[PDB]
Amino acid sequence: DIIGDIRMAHCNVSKATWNETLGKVVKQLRKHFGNNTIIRFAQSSGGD
Amino acid sequence: TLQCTNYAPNLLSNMRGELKQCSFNMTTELRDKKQKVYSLFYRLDVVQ
Amino acid sequence: QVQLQESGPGLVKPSETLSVTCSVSGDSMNNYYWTWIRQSPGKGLEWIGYISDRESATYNPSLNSRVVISRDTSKNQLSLKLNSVTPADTAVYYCATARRGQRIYGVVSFGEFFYYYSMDVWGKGTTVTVSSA
Amino acid sequence: GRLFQSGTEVKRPGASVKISCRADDDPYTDDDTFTKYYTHWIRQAPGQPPEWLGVISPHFARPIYSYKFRDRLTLTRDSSLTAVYFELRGLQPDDTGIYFCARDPFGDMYPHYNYHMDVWGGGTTVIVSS
Amino acid sequence: EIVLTQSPAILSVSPGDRVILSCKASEGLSSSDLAWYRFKGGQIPTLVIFGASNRARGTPDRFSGSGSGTDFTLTINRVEPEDFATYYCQRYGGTPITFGGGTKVDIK
Amino acid sequence: VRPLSVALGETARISCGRQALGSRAVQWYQHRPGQAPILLIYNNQDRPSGIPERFSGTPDINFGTRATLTISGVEAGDEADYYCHMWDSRSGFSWSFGGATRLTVLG
Ligand SMILES: *[C@@H]1O[C@H](CO)[C@@H](O[C@@H]2O[C@H](CO)[C@@H](O[C@@H]3O[C@H](CO[C@H]4O[C@H](CO[C@H]5O[C@H](CO)[C@@H](O)[C@H](O)[C@@H]5O)[C@@H](O)[C@H](O[C@H]5O[C@H](CO)[C@@H](O)[C@H](O)[C@@H]5O)[C@@H]4O)[C@@H](O)[C@H](O[C@H]4O[C@H](CO)[C@@H](O)[C@H](O)[C@@H]4O[C@H]4O[C@H](CO)[C@@H](O)[C@H](O)[C@@H]4O)[C@@H]3O)[C@H](O)[C@H]2NC(C)=O)[C@H](O)[C@H]1NC(C)=O
Ligand SMILES: *[C@@H]1O[C@H](CO)[C@@H](O[C@@H]2O[C@H](CO)[C@@H](O[C@@H]3O[C@H](CO)[C@@H](O)[C@H](O)[C@@H]3O)[C@H](O)[C@H]2NC(C)=O)[C@H](O)[C@H]1NC(C)=O
Ligand SMILES: *[C@@H]1O[C@H](CO)[C@@H](O[C@@H]2O[C@H](CO)[C@@H](O)[C@H](O)[C@H]2NC(C)=O)[C@H](O)[C@H]1NC(C)=O
Ligand SMILES: *[C@@H]1O[C@H](CO)[C@@H](O)[C@H](O)[C@H]1NC(C)=O
Ligand SMILES: *[C@@H]1O[C@H](CO)[C@@H](O)[C@H](O)[C@H]1NC(C)=O
Ligand SMILES: *[C@@H]1O[C@H](CO)[C@@H](O)[C@H](O)[C@H]1NC(C)=O
Ligand SMILES: *[C@@H]1O[C@H](CO)[C@@H](O)[C@H](O)[C@H]1NC(C)=O
């Protein structure tokens, strides 16, 4: 049984350093596709 | 055959479809006798 | 400060429209949630229903929808209608207020919290007896 | 040896089609074919050159669509490790033709990392009218 | 996007000679990502060659072909009555892949 | 309905029959016969105005404890029954109040 509260597990990440890491990897990836190309992060496709 | 209904009913939280309560028979060390057992299984573990 | 006065018919014939009205004086009814509690002799308290700013008359499911809750903002009153009543609920009524405070145990983003209704200011309450005689 | 797909279904404009391409026909089989081999789905119209329609990976059935058929094409497999599906919602009277499913290692195998569709299977037909 | 064209669209030959199936690429193929298929009406389209020049399992000695850069050739040694069918070449690389239009041999 | 008999001077601990399961948020009541009910303790720690500082509840730290009401300095007129309203997570929206613990002080 569950002796307590029915809760859901959840993973926490810090927003500021994750946004800085995304900006850094975008600035790194921008060395291969010129300057004025809009890089868009999206969700997954699907499957299992 | 798992007779399985919803555990923790009428909960207004997010976790509603998961945590289902099912009962089933299981064999013991004496093969003529059985044992009724109760357990909780997730939504991704049971198929109707 | 919110003050509550009561009014009652007293003598009620069975199986018709019952109406017991409490009046509010002192403030408006914009945020406080009005509820009604029935106290019968021989048992404990009983929750009839409550109303909110959503104008939702959520009744108790153990009453078989025999009560009707309504409010009004133009005359500072509220109507408590009944139909097809029994002679076995001779009880004193109560008109109370209730504030809603949230209780959070996990994260608010998923909805792992709930609501309660605290009743701090109550009314005097007038008894209503129903009988065939 | 050879792949198996069935179906000679007719359709109406505004519906969806379901094409299943299995390998080794008996249903209780453990071919393991959809396990380390990519699978290509290819459409061909009569009187037209064949065009690419979509590949599915054998790792966890992660699909790779094209930009022409992106928002109206979902395809995956079931709990058993056979019988990949093909759901094409948002029909049209332009894609009337034959459909093919081909096995392809796609440069993931151990010998030589080749690029070839070694076997194609069946080839169904989809028509639509009113 | 690399468009794959084929200029010998219509071909006719007798059984027992060598035929040339040429294909032109748009801009600089990698010379290792190309395939040839033998299509027919209401049959099983099988493969005949790997990459630039490498035979498959069910392929005899008479099927070969090479090419590099932007030109790719298929060189059949002899013509059989079981080979009078259309051919389709395709490339690989970035999705979506594109076939090479279409060519066809005939008996005359 | 459960009776209780506590003499003068010493304190008393009153529990309700509803076994709490989860995060608790109780509202302890007190109803004199004929008068109006009043709110004593809400949200397990707080107390409204006008109520004396003699009623202490139980916090929600170290879940597994009993939600009781402590009456320090019991006087002679404490004959009104109490009500232990239960609001938790698993049982959902509770409608009824519960058993009325009738405290009868002697002397
Ligand atoms: C990933 O991240 C997410 C967030 O992004 C994390 O979720 C967070 O999870 C924790 C618990 O795991 C939640 O804490 C809970 O909060 C509720 C209510 O929130 C209170 O805190 C707010 C913060 O403000 C200060 O106050 C607290 C003390 O209350 C300080 O300790 C803090 O440091 C802050 O400085 C506050 O804004 C709230 O608002 C209310 O404030 C006052 C007080 O009531 C009112 O006047 C206001 O009007 C308004 O209503 C509120 O104060 C708490 O209730 C929870 O504590 C209770 O439950 C515990 C477990 O049962 C128990 O141990 C506690 O003792 C407590 O029980 C009793 O204690 C109080 C003591 O005074 C009593 O008064 C009270 O009645 C109660 O009965 C709990 O602490 C976060 O809210 C949640 N975050 C969000 C955004 O929802 C997640 O955990 C992360 N995951 C991982 C893996 O890292
Ligand atoms: C990775 O893929 C790219 C893209 O296909 C490959 O680049 C291509 O390389 C060929 C040479 O092998 C280039 O062809 C050349 O074209 C010029 C004219 O542009 C011509 O003058 C030369 O004689 C030659 O034919 C081709 O243009 C080039 N494509 C692109 C888009 O740059 C590359 O070879 C692949 N492999 C790696 C990087 O290992
Ligand atoms: C084995 O059992 C699973 C679980 O039911 C089957 O998967 C479902 O199959 C039905 C077929 O009508 C689909 O409608 C469901 O969507 C499937 N559930 C999924 C994918 O989660 C599976 O088909 C069974 N295998 C057999 C009978 O060979
Ligand atoms: C995660 O855990 C570490 C453990 O030390 C802690 O320092 C940190 O504050 C926690 N939270 C986040 C958002 O990283
Ligand atoms: C992320 O970092 C960039 C730094 O260039 C900043 O401009 C931006 O406001 C940050 N936040 C988001 C949500 O992008
Ligand atoms: C993109 O911008 C950076 C700015 O530092 C520059 O160095 C780089 O040359 C630019 N890319 C191109 C293709 O000009
Ligand atoms: C276990 O077996 C008995 C034997 O008749 C049956 O009545 C019972 O329903 C079984 N248990 C379950 C959970 O089906």
mmCIF file of N, CA, C and O in Angstrom, chain A residues 7-27:
data_model
loop_
_atom_site.group_PDB
_atom_site.id
_atom_site.type_symbol
_atom_site.label_atom_id
_atom_site.label_comp_id
_atom_site.label_asym_id
_atom_site.label_seq_id
_atom_site.Cartn_x
_atom_site.Cartn_y
_atom_site.Cartn_z
ATOM 1 N N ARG A 7 1.342 11.077 -4.642
ATOM 2 C CA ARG A 7 2.040 12.106 -5.400
ATOM 3 C C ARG A 7 2.663 11.493 -6.650
ATOM 4 O O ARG A 7 2.637 10.277 -6.857
ATOM 5 N N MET A 8 3.233 12.358 -7.485
ATOM 6 C CA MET A 8 3.864 11.966 -8.737
ATOM 7 C C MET A 8 5.330 12.375 -8.702
ATOM 8 O O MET A 8 5.653 13.498 -8.299
ATOM 9 N N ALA A 9 6.211 11.459 -9.102
ATOM 10 C CA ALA A 9 7.631 11.762 -9.189
ATOM 11 C C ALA A 9 7.896 12.780 -10.292
ATOM 12 O O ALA A 9 7.245 12.779 -11.340
ATOM 13 N N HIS A 10 8.862 13.660 -10.045
ATOM 14 C CA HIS A 10 9.132 14.754 -10.965
ATOM 15 C C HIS A 10 10.590 15.165 -10.842
ATOM 16 O O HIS A 10 11.112 15.268 -9.729
ATOM 17 N N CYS A 11 11.234 15.419 -11.980
ATOM 18 C CA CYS A 11 12.629 15.838 -11.984
ATOM 19 C C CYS A 11 12.739 17.343 -12.163
ATOM 20 O O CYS A 11 12.121 17.928 -13.058
ATOM 21 N N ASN A 12 13.517 17.957 -11.274
ATOM 22 C CA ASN A 12 13.729 19.393 -11.212
ATOM 23 C C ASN A 12 15.084 19.712 -11.824
ATOM 24 O O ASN A 12 16.081 19.047 -11.513
ATOM 25 N N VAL A 13 15.112 20.728 -12.684
ATOM 26 C CA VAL A 13 16.347 21.276 -13.228
ATOM 27 C C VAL A 13 16.336 22.783 -12.980
ATOM 28 O O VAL A 13 15.267 23.397 -12.889
ATOM 29 N N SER A 14 17.517 23.363 -12.790
ATOM 30 C CA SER A 14 17.611 24.806 -12.613
ATOM 31 C C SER A 14 17.442 25.498 -13.959
ATOM 32 O O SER A 14 18.071 25.115 -14.948
ATOM 33 N N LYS A 15 16.582 26.520 -13.995
ATOM 34 C CA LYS A 15 16.196 27.142 -15.256
ATOM 35 C C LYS A 15 17.293 28.023 -15.845
ATOM 36 O O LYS A 15 17.472 28.028 -17.069
ATOM 37 N N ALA A 16 18.040 28.745 -15.002
ATOM 38 C CA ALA A 16 18.987 29.742 -15.496
ATOM 39 C C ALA A 16 20.186 29.091 -16.175
ATOM 40 O O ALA A 16 20.555 29.464 -17.296
ATOM 41 N N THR A 17 20.806 28.107 -15.515
ATOM 42 C CA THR A 17 21.944 27.425 -16.116
ATOM 43 C C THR A 17 21.544 26.538 -17.289
ATOM 44 O O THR A 17 22.345 26.368 -18.211
ATOM 45 N N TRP A 18 20.312 26.021 -17.310
ATOM 46 C CA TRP A 18 19.851 25.259 -18.466
ATOM 47 C C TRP A 18 19.611 26.165 -19.667
ATOM 48 O O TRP A 18 19.939 25.794 -20.800
ATOM 49 N N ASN A 19 19.054 27.359 -19.436
ATOM 50 C CA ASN A 19 18.891 28.325 -20.517
ATOM 51 C C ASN A 19 20.238 28.835 -21.019
ATOM 52 O O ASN A 19 20.411 29.036 -22.228
ATOM 53 N N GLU A 20 21.206 29.018 -20.113
ATOM 54 C CA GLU A 20 22.553 29.401 -20.526
ATOM 55 C C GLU A 20 23.244 28.289 -21.308
ATOM 56 O O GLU A 20 23.962 28.570 -22.275
ATOM 57 N N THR A 21 23.018 27.028 -20.926
ATOM 58 C CA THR A 21 23.593 25.902 -21.656
ATOM 59 C C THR A 21 22.964 25.762 -23.039
ATOM 60 O O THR A 21 23.659 25.456 -24.017
ATOM 61 N N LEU A 22 21.652 26.006 -23.142
ATOM 62 C CA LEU A 22 20.990 25.993 -24.443
ATOM 63 C C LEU A 22 21.472 27.131 -25.336
ATOM 64 O O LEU A 22 21.689 26.921 -26.535
ATOM 65 N N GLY A 23 21.670 28.326 -24.770
ATOM 66 C CA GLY A 23 22.245 29.418 -25.540
ATOM 67 C C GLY A 23 23.672 29.155 -25.981
ATOM 68 O O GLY A 23 24.048 29.497 -27.107
ATOM 69 N N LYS A 24 24.469 28.511 -25.124
ATOM 70 C CA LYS A 24 25.840 28.162 -25.477
ATOM 71 C C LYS A 24 25.904 27.097 -26.566
ATOM 72 O O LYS A 24 26.724 27.209 -27.484
ATOM 73 N N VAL A 25 25.043 26.077 -26.504
ATOM 74 C CA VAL A 25 25.065 25.059 -27.552
ATOM 75 C C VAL A 25 24.447 25.585 -28.849
ATOM 76 O O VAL A 25 24.851 25.151 -29.933
ATOM 77 N N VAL A 26 23.546 26.572 -28.780
ATOM 78 C CA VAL A 26 23.064 27.226 -29.995
ATOM 79 C C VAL A 26 24.166 28.075 -30.626
ATOM 80 O O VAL A 26 24.362 28.046 -31.850
ATOM 81 N N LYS A 27 24.929 28.804 -29.802
ATOM 82 C CA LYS A 27 26.058 29.584 -30.304
ATOM 83 C C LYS A 27 27.168 28.692 -30.854
ATOM 84 O O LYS A 27 27.890 29.097 -31.771
#
